[PDB]
Amino acid sequence: LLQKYVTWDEHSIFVNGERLMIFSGEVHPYRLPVASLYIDIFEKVKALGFNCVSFYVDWALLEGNPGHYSAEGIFDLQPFFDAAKEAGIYLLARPGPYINAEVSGGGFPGWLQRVDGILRTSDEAYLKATDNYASNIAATIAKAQITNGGPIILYQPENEYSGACCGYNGFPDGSYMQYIEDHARDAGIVVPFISNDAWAAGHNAPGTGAGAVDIYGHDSYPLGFDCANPSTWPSGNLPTYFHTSHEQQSPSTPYSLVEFQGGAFDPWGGVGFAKCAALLNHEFERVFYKNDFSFGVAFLNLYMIFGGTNWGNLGHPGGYTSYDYGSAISESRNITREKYSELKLLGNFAKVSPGYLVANPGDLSTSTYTNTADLTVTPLLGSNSSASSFFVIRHSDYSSQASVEYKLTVPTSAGNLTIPQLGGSLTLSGRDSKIHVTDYDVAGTNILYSTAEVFTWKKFNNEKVLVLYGGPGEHHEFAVSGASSSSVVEGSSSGISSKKVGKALVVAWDVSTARRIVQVGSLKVFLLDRNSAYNYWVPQVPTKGTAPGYSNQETTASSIIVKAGYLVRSAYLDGNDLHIQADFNATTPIEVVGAPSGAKNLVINGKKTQTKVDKNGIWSASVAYTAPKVQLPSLKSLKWKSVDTLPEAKNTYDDSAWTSADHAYTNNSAHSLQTPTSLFASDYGYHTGALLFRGHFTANGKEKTFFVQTKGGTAYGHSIWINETYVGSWAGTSINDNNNATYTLPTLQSGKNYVITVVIDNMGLDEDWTIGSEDMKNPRGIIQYSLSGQEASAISWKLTGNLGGENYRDTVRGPLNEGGLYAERQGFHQPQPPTQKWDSSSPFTGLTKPGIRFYSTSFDLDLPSGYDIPLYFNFGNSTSTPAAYRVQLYVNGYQYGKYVNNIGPQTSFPVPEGILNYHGTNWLALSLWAQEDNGAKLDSFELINTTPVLTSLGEVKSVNQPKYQARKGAY
Ligand SMILES: *[C@@H]1O[C@H](CO)[C@@H](O[C@@H]2O[C@H](CO)[C@@H](O[C@@H]3O[C@H](CO[C@H]4O[C@H](CO[C@H]5O[C@H](CO)[C@@H](O)[C@H](O)[C@@H]5O[C@H]5O[C@H](CO)[C@@H](O)[C@H](O)[C@@H]5O)[C@@H](O)[C@H](O[C@H]5O[C@H](CO)[C@@H](O)[C@H](O)[C@@H]5O[C@H]5O[C@H](CO)[C@@H](O)[C@H](O)[C@@H]5O)[C@@H]4O)[C@@H](O)[C@H](O[C@@H]4O[C@H](CO)[C@@H](O)[C@H](O)[C@@H]4O)[C@@H]3O)[C@H](O)[C@H]2NC(C)=O)[C@H](O)[C@H]1NC(C)=O
Numbered sequence: 001l002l003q004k005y006v007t008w009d010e011h012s013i014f015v016n017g018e019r020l021m022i023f024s025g026e027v028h029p030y031r032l033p034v035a036s037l038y039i040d041i042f043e044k045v046k047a048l049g050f051n052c053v054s055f056y057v058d059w060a061l062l063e064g065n066p067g068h069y070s071a072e073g074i075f076d077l078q079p080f081f082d083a084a085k086e087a088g089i090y091l092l093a094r095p096g097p098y099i100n101a102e103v104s105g106g107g108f109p110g111w112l113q114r115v116d117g118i119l120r121t122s123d124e125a126y127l128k129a130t131d132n133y134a135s136n137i138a139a140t141i142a143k144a145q146i147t148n149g150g151p152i153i154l155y156q157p158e159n160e161y162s163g164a165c166c167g168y169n170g171f172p173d174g175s176y177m178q179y180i181e182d183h184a185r186d187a188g189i190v191v192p193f194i195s196n197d198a199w200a201a202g203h204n205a206p207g208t209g210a211g212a213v214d215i216y217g218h219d220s221y222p223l224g225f226d227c228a229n230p231s232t233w234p235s236g237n238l239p240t241y242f243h244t245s246h247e248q249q250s251p252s253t254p255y256s257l258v259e260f261q262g263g264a265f266d267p268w269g270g271v272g273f274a275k276c277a278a279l280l281n282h283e284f285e286r287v288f289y290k291n292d293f294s295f296g297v298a299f300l301n302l303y304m305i306f307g308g309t310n311w312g313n314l315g316h317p318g319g320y321t322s323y324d325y326g327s328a329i330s331e332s333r334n335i336t337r338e339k340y341s342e343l344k345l346l347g348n349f350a351k352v353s354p355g356y357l358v359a360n361p362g363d364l365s366t367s368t369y370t371n372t373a374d375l376t377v378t379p380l381l382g383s384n385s386s387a388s389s390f391f392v393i394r395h396s397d398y399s400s401q402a403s404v405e406y407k408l409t410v411p412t413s414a415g416n417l418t419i420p421q422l423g424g425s426l427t428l429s430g431r432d433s434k435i436h437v438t439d440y441d442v443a444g445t446n447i448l449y450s451t452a453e454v455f456t457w458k459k460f461n462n463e464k465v466l467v468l469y470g471g472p473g474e475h476h477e478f479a480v481s482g483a484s485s486s487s488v489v490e491g492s493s494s495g496i497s498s499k500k501v502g503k504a505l506v507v508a509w510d511v512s513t514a515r516r517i518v519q520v521g522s523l524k525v526f527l528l529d530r531n532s533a534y535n536y537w538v539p540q541v542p543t544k545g546t547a548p549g550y551s552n553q554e555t556t557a558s559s560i561i562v563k564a565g566y567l568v569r570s571a572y573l574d575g576n577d578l579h580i581q582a583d584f585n586a587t588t589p590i591e592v593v594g595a596p597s598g599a600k601n602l603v604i605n606g607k608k609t610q611t612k613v614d615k616n617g618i619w620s621a622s623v624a625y626t627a628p629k630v631q632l633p634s635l636k637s638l639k640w641k642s643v644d645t646l647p648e649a650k651n652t653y654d655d656s657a658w659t660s661a662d663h664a665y666t667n668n669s670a671h672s673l674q675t676p677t678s679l680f681a682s683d684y685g686y687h688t689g690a691l692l693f694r695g696h697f698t699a700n701g702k703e704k705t706f707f708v709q710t711k712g713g714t715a716y717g718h719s720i721w722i723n724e725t726y727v728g729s730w731a732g733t734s735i736n737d738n739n740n741a742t743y744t745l746p747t748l749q750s751g752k753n754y755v756i757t758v759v760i761d762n763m764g765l766d767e768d769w770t771i772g773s774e775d776m777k778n779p780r781g782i783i784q785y786s787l788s789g790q791e792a793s794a795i796s797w798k799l800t801g802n803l804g805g806e807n808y809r810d811t812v813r814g815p816l817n818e819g820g821l822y823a824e825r826q827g828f829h830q831p832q833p834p835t836q837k838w839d840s841s842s843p844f845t846g847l848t849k850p851g852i853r854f855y856s857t858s859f860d861l862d863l864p865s866g867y868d869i870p871l872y873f874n875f876g877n878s879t880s881t882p883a884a885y886r887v888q889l890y891v892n893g894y895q896y897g898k899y900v901n902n903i904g905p906q907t908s909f910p911v912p913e914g915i916l917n918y919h920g921t922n923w924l925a926l927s928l929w930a931q932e933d934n935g936a937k938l939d940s941f942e943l944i945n946t947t948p949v950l951t952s953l954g955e956v957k958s959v960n961q962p963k964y965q966a967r968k969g970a971y
Pocket residue numbers: 278281283335336337338341403429430432471472473513529531532534535565566567585586947
């Protein structure tokens with residue numbers, strides 16, 4: 001419409017006038033605040049065979065101060081866009097304004113709690129509040145569009161605009177979506193708009209009038225977000241209606257799953273992301289992702305492919321620090337999980353199978369395509385008798401762990417065939433799914449059919465190579481049209497049969513851990529078992545430069561096949577040297593199939609490597625791996641300095657500079673006040689981290705109890721003191737976001753002044769998933785209070801959150817990073833704090849009573865260069881009954897962890913190189929808040945590493961780490 005770079009028809013999207021099956025992975029730039037590491041994520045995504053990445057932009061981080069959009073330094077998106085382009089990955093931009101994403105406010109900055117309008121509606125105040133952010137982010141995205149030589153090809157307006165409740169009846173509001181769309185277009189956005197309906201409801205589909213997007217898309221998370229039972233696949237959870245609904249809701253556009261389950265989030269007191277990785281494992285992928293292909297999906301994005309970390313309080317209360325998500329690429333960026341390797345097999349199948357996009361999805365059947373009803377097959381039939389067809393097979397009961405033998409009865413250019421034709425039966429093992437192919441094209445050679453799955457294929461000059469694989473214990477068969485005979489050119493000929501049947505040469509074989517290569521004419525067919533296929537890679541090879549280029553027919557055709565190990569990032573030909581960039585985590589045998597004619601030498605990670613060439617023209621070599629020594633500090637043995645970070649609990653404390661909580665009104669349109677003045681922190685500009693309230697009053701001697709209702713979000717906690725006397729604490733739980741408590745008080749002297757100090761942990765602002773719920777407006781602070789024997793107005797309040805509130809002090813680390821604790825307000829969490837007069841006490845000694853202390857220490861690192869080494873800070877928790885205490889982890893000023901001993905479940909906190917300095921000094925800081933009478937201390941706290949990966953990744957540049965500087969107006 002507005003451009004010709006990205007177009008579409010009923011079958012697929014076209015990029016540069018060429019059909020492209022778009023297989024994407026979700027990555028959030030703000031969850032990995034290290035520019036140097038973006039290229040790593042993109043290369044790992046490209047290595048899966050993917051060609052696109054989908055990303056959100058978090059408004060709360062870019063306009064923390066209303067009226068001032070700021071996306072510089074670690075918040076700069078340019079390095080993210082540049083890495084995508086460098087890696088040859090396109091982008092789907094999803095700026096919101098509302099993104100949900102399990103982030104604080106669902107993306108909404110805390111000041112939205114002061115906006116007099118229902119969020120995500122046409123209410124004037126809400127729309128106006130989004131204008132500054134929307135115009136700025138759209139302009140930034142506009143410059144990176146493919147129409148301007150950038151990687152961005154699609155744009156998503158809003159996010160899961162799919163439902164309302166609670167009094168708001170304007171949904172769906174055509175003019176609302178049209179407003180977002182018009183504003184983006186006015187900002188320069190010309191690429192197509194794609195939606196992401198929460199479910200297949202057809203909202204904003206083409207033809208629905210105002211607000212309609214260009215390509216209708218929807219989401220799906222079939223296994224849910226509770227990973228407690230990783231091996232349980234509930235009955236009926238596998239969707240079977242996506243194609244039907246698509247033809248009814250948006251038949252004119254390519255079927256698109258903008259968000260398809262790639263893992264799951266986990267709540268405070270949850271089960272841990274390891275279980276989520278186990279639930280959404282390699283079996284889940286092959287069964288559910290191939291099920292998506294059975295619907296003819298042309299755009300598939302997996303949420304998440306890499307989750308990252310909710311550092312600096314950017315996450316919502318419904319989750320904790322980690323956002324590992326159990327995705328293919330872990331929080332520490334590793335790709336050891338089997339799900340990564342399995343996904344690579346499907347990604348590479350899609351990349352070399354144009355026939356799949358033009359095939360017509362049909363209805364599933366338990367009788368038409370096999371000899372047993374225990375199996376279900378969904379056909380994707382070619383346009384004519386000679387066109388390629390695909391058959392997605394699975395157990396009829398998708399959760400079945402049974403092994404079933406069968407025979408495939410499918411239509412082909414040679415008529416209806418019953419396979420195997422040479423005898424025996426095929427096997428579908430537990431929780432597996434396969435895509436059988438017929439009349440599949442391999443550079444002009446017709447593969448009449450293949451039961452074993454296609455990993456990849458290439459034409460190297462006059463030689464053709466096809467890579468097939470089957471799972472353990474399977475018998476397979478394939479046929480090549482017009483072929484006369486075959487020869488086993490590698491491996492034993494045992495179990496391999498070859499016979500000319502009709503106008504095709506049929507070859508039968510049994511899966512083995514040993515590779516067999518069968519030569520059929522000019523075609524070399526590699527016969528592999530799944531686990532061997534896991535080690536193959538298909539890097540693109542550009543003629544000029546080192547960048548692979550985007551994925552298209554041409555770059556796909558000039559790619560090569562490399563058998564290696566942990567990872568193969570890229571390859572390029574420089575003169576007569578074939579360069580391969582890869583990572584290794586063990587001794588790795590190397591094989592290169594299809595080295596360019598001009599290539600004479602093999603260079604791996606810049607090192608000339610000894611290679612030999614075999615009868616099949618395969619280059620072979622080996623890369624040695626020797627685990628290097630990784631010297632890490634013993635945290636317990638470091639020199640620690642500490643300071644009381646609750647000076648408010650002393651009679652000498654002066655809070656005159658604090659904000660007076662004196663508004664006899666609230667700007668929160670969803671919650672009326674129950675106190676004389678507003679005690680909702682957002683009404684005063686405090687939206688993140690620890691919040692403190694101090695209520696001053698003159699006693700009348702009749703006081704006995706102090707009732708109070710606090711609210712800090714799920715898993716929050718609070719602690720109270722009256723002058724220097726401890727009153728009590730609400731240690732919190734995984735199911736409470738607020739708490740009502742009546743505390744008794746010591747006797748007070750009439751005529752004397754007292755102050756009640758209430759410290760409240762803020763776990764972030766809630767999302768607003770259902771429009772009209774206004775859940776994002778759930779306040780943080782004091783909701784109710786009553787001092788017995790006194791009028792509520794007898795107490796005058798002061799409050800504080802992060803120093804300066806919306807006029808936040810750390811422009812480099814963002815509006816959410818630091819909370820309101822004394823040490824944070826002073827900036828003591830930054831490198832080189834003023835510890836000269838501090839005490840020499842460590843967190844291992846801790847506190848012997850309720851309170852909050854801040855700790856500091858430093859240590860130097862000089863880790864092995866040339867290695868990608870994940871570092872984690874681990875807290876011990878071997879005790880049966882957990883002590884009640886909260887910890888905030890600060891590394892070089894960046895908060896990278898909120899630890900709640902009594903709630904969990906996180907004990908291991910990864911921190912990326914870039915935040916940590918691997919060849920310099922590091923400043924570690926911790927706040928320790930004891931919420932029990934016995935006090936609190938750390939029993940075990942260590943810095944550990946996991947497998948050092950021999951890498952080709954460039955040196956990681958340390959991000960800006962502003963050192964401590966005395967702050968004006970601090971208190
Ligand atoms: C360096 O990086 C690499 C990555 O690049 C890291 O390697 C990855 O490590 C992962 C662990 O962290 C690992 O995942 C676990 O795998 C467990 C093993 O099961 C799988 O493998 C079986 C075959 O073993 C061979 O391959 C694996 C690796 O794939 C290897 O570890 C073995 O040593 C062995 O290798 C040798 O053979 C291959 C060729 O075959 C050669 O290439 C090698 O050189 C060696 O010679 C395989 O049978 C199994 O599949 C069966 O079981 C799964 C379910 O577990 C089914 O889905 C599947 O259908 C199949 O079941 C059928 O067949 C069997 C056998 O006939 C039959 O009995 C059944 O009835 C059915 O018919 C797997 O692919 C796995 O147990 C484990 O799972 C965990 O535990 C339980 C399992 O009970 C599970 O429910 C949990 O969810 C949990 O995940 C993991 O999946 C990756 O596979 C591995 N990837 C690669 C590429 O190697 C490496 O660790 C890292 N190094 C360091 C130091 O960090």
